[PDB]
Design a protein around this ligand. Structure first.
Ligand SMILES: [Hg+2]
Ligand SMILES: [Hg+2]
Ligand SMILES: [Hg+2]
Ligand SMILES: [Hg+2]
Length: 259
């Protein structure tokens, strides 16, 4: 919509002739930023997004024994996820009475949905994540954009032939050996409500087609190959320290597997 002017702000001048990071790619070939620590001034971004009164929805599915992960997930989200912005948590669960009573900061709310236009009217952006995880560092408005995916932490250095895309030509998820930008992992993705709904609709229809044909993150990866994300998140945003350690290229570990 219409955007008011930013206030005067004091911060270091960007350096045109100094690369931001010399160890990683910070922009895709379709000119989407790749979000790594060092690439963004969060003060500028926070102003931009607050001036739009941005609301973020955070969606998590917690079925069967996965309800046990909700307490740490929500407690740590309170510490690290979009602090200062309006947040609406949506917990989808088969056990509503097992959702823990977590204390929320001001301007934050939680809805329990037992297991669409509702999302369009309540939030600007949707962020869809796995519940068996914890936040350990800042995850903020730097991620927000019409459509984002996150690099699979196991594969960010891999050649595309090694990616575990669907390789059966009979599947709607098929990606040939000579195609592919990145291997995205579906544990952390999101976008505008409209773009997230477009993605999940496309996935659901392709999954139904495969099922009809007797075939069963492959669908996410096919979608993002054919509909390029407007930001890509580095593996800072979806990590497993037990399996992968803390490499020098990761300045922060923001959202991590629970051991
Ligand atoms: Hg930089
Ligand atoms: Hg979602
Ligand atoms: Hg899809
Ligand atoms: Hg999908």
């Amino acid at each position: 919509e219409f955007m008011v002017s930013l206030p005067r702000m004091v911060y270091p001048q960007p350096k045109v002739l100094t690369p931001c990071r010399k160890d990683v790619l910070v922009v895709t070939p379709w000119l989407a930023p790749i979000v790594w620590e060092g690439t963004f001034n969060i003060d500028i971004l926070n102003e931009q997004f607050r001036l739009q009164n941005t609301t973020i929805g955070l969606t998590v599915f917690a079925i069967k024994k996965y309800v046990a992960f909700l307490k740490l997930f929500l407690e740590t989200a309170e510490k690290h996820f979009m602090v200062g912005h309006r947040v609406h948590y949506y917990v989808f669960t088969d056990q509503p009475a097992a959702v823990p009573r977590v204390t929320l900061g001001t301007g934050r709310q939680l809805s329990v949905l037992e297991v669409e236009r509702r999302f369009l009217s309540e939030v600007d952006y949707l962020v869809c994540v796995d519940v068996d995880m914890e936040f350990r560092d800042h995850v903020g408005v730097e991620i927000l954009t019409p459509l984002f995916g996150t690099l699979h932490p196991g594969f960010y250095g891999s050649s595309r032939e090694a990616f575990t895309y669907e390789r059966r030509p009979q599947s709607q998820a098929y990606i040939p050996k000579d195609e592919g930008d990145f291997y995205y992992l579906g544990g952390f993705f999101g976008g505008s409500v409209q773009e997230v709904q477009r993605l999940t609709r496309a996935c659901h229809q392709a999954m139904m087609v495969d099922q009809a044909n007797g075939i069963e993150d492959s669908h996410l990866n096919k979608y993002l190959l054919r509909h390029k994300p407007t930001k890509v998140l580095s593996p800072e945003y979806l990590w497993d320290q037990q399996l992968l350690g803390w490499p020098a290229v990761l300045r922060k570990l923001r959202f991590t597997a629970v051991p």
